[PDB]
A paper describes a structure:
RBD is responsible for receptor recognition, which had been mapped to the CTD in previous structural studies. dACE2 shares 83.88% primary sequence identity with hACE2. When infected with the authentic SARS-CoV-2, the number of copies of SARS-CoV-2 ORF1ab obviously increased in HeLa cells expressing either dACE2 or hACE2 at 48 and 72 h after infection, compared with that of cells not expressing these two molecules. These results confirm that dACE2 is indeed a cellular receptor that supports SARS-CoV-2 infecting host cells, similar to its human ortholog, hACE2.
The RBD/dACE2 complex was prepared using size exclusion chromatography and the structure was solved to 3.0 Å resolution, with one RBD binding to a single dACE2 molecule in the asymmetric unit. The structure of RBD in the complex includes residues T333 to P526, all of which have a clear density. In the complex, 18 dACE2 residues (Q19, L23, T26, F27, E29, K30, Y33, E36, E37, Y40, Q41, T81, Y82, E325, N329, K352, D354, and R356) form atomic contacts with 18 RBD residues (R403, K417, G446, Y449, Y453, L455, F456, A475, F486, N487, Y489, G496, Q498, T500, N501, G502, Y505, and Q506). The total number of atomic contacts between dACE2 and RBD is 127. The contact interface in the RBD has a saddle shape with two protrusive side parts and a recessed center part, and can be divided into two contact regions (CRs), CR1 (R403, G446, Y449, Q498, T500, N501, G502, and Q506) and CR2 (K417, Y453, L455, F456, F486, N487, and Y489). The CR1 is mainly composed of polar residues, whereas the CR2 is mainly composed of hydrophobic and aromatic residues.
Author numbering:
A (entry chain A): 18 to 707, 722 to 726
B (entry chain B): 333 to 527
Write the structure that this text describes.
Amino acid sequence: MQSTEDLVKTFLEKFNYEAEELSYQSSLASWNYNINITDENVQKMNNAGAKWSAFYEEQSKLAKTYPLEEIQDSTVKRQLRALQHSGSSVLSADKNQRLNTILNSMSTIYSTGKACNPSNPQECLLLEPGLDDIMENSKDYNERLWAWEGWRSEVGKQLRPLYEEYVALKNEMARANNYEDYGDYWRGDYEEEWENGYNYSRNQLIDDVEHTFTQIMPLYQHLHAYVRTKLMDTYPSYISPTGCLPAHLLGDMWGRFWTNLYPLTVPFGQKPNIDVTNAMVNQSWDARKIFKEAEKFFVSVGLPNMTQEFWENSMLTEPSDSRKVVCHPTAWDLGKGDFRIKMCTKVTMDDFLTAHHEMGHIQYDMAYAAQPFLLRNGANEGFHEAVGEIMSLSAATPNHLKNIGLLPPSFFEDSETEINFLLKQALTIVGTLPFTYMLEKWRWMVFKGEIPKDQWMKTWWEMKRNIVGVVEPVPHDETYCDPASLFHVANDYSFIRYYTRTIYQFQFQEALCQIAKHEGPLHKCDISNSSEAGQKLLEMLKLGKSKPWTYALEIVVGAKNMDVRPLLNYFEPLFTWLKEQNRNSFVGWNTDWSPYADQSIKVRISLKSALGEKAYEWNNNEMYLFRSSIAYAMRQYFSEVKNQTIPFVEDNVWVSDLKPRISFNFFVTSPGNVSDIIPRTEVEEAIRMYLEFLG
Amino acid sequence: TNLCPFGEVFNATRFASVYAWNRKRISNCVADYSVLYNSASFSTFKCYGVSPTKLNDLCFTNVYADSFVIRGDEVRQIAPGQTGKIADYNYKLPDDFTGCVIAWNSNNLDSKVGGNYNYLYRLFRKSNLKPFERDISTEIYQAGSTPCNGVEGFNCYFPLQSYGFQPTNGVGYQPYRVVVLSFELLHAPATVCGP
Ligand SMILES: *[C@@H]1O[C@H](CO)[C@@H](O)[C@H](O)[C@H]1NC(C)=O
Ligand SMILES: [Zn+2]
């Protein structure tokens, strides 16, 4: 006499009240660890986390008992769909912890792996802060080369065997969950089956990402062409005005953001951009003044004040005493009305705008706090960091800084400073989209099985050249796993999170400013003192995950899908300026070019029998003897012609454009100096003294 | 001059859980209501039928003081015509209720580090409570069609749940001590007046 939906509603009310408490104990144990790192707080975190996990997996199996088909209510269907999702609960105890063994291994190898300087083997540098300091600050071609190649050789090669068993187990897990692959498993974040109209497919995410990207590529090419022209003045002798950009000159280890190339590509370095760090320390600004003035910004747009529990339990300063703390900035929704922010706040402009960003996460958390426990999250995986970023966009404006006293009433922004601002934004916002687009498409192909493991790197670099316009400084065979050199890849983190969020920011931003009656360019808007904008924004923040993200997006923008047009509208003043700066330039890259094809030797392997006969048919270790044979020829050459004892090894012979069993190119570098490529005719001389060679 | 013992109800060191809400009958005494409404200690002093003022001028044949502890989110349910886990299953006030509902924050007293789980509330019941009815039942609630046999199981849940009272919760989840004064005028001698 009681319907199944009535049985699951009773079951969910039974789940909600202990899940809300067990999740509060796990976060409180994790919070006390993050603000006080000890050896008994780690176990308290691991104990409460294991108790919270074991309870969730227990209810997750009892949730599959209820058929999702016989439930016509919609808000209740979402809690089951989120609870009936096993995850890795579908695998054997053998395969599960072997999978956990790989993920833990890939994390420590990433966080503890080092790269040693070829000039001093005793100077072995970690990524943070060692290698990142080099890749984010240095302008030396060779210094960035050994750090770029070293990180991917010493540490990246160790992740290749781990990532191969990783892809196999995660796909094996996803297929048991009735998914296509692990990439299709990730794309279920955006999948929606509502009644009609507000639906969303998983294959549709593939189509929408590609459609938006070809609308971004025009803006990216002129930015790529401009940065290429400006780095010629920084790196002459190393880049060609027609080919791709070397991977180790893009501002960081992977080229994720081009922000650190701003001093080299500044449009008008004569004029500095707006920095309010000095204006704050002269005004006696402290950590509480930053958050209280950030609090007055959200209440000015119609959002509630911060809780008093937020001002007593949050840690907004680094402890003065002996207390090691994690203070990578995070916003915490512990539950039961407990919201705090953990941050080593300094009196700087960057820490000023991140405060508005992390407080934006808090306002989002407090809004959907009235929803059931299984619906207390963003509409999709990109709404949270997008809502926080539109707060810093309006807070960093000259209009807002003019109102809070950090910039004088005698302020006027000229034509050049906004070109400086929009480019520094483009190096961070526009420069990461092709990198974010290609990394996920690569992992989507690998999970799907479209790219075999014997061509993982050969395809990875073909798309960096074609999609991102970035070329390897040295060729990487199938012993490298360069994608795994990123934090999000070696730690099982989805990366399309940062691509859709970027589209979601300016989609929200343009819609909120038209409500605020903003006139002029979009990068000049400020939603401050606009109640009708924040309350319209608060309408979506209340929904959380109770409604499909196409519905939640339409409540704010008036459209149910990703629209890149607001993003291109945000950078139109710069896109208009880059085109006139690129008239006498090349817009685009030639995929053929490389920093080493200038001195490499084409080689055509002799097919002494029909192709397809493994009688001889050179393979990987026949290439090993070849690279050792040329290494021997280079040893005799320098010793007999130059009286120089130089220990060439197979690792000095780099093979590129390798088509197995048929053809390849190769060049030679000096030991300990991958920057020093041996001249080609000097190498061809060593081969003549001791297949086809084209010349 | 027998003043009504309001100190034993309000200043009590420990209150009862709402599913077993405690009631004390106050009779043939002198009630000063000035100590109650003129006090800034209470966050909620909503009165129905009666008024906060014009209360030392009336005479009732009894006065009942229902005292209990709920969360801050559920204090709004202590009112005529309200719906919720407290009003439906724990403590229901009639539609024509004549009296005062008094509540105040007690994070100082009823919350503890690690958790305070001594306060309980009924989560499941076959039907809604009638006004001023108390249910201290402990039978296993059967939501489905199979008998529970007195043990917790699938679609068979224990009806009474505990509150999680840590001092770090938001005020919505913090403990609130509630006192409900009901005024009684009958065919009776009109015990309690108060100048
Ligand atoms: C509680 O006791 C204090 C003294 O112990 C007294 O001043 C106060 O009036 C009492 N409150 C009530 C409501 O009886
Ligand atoms: Zn954030």
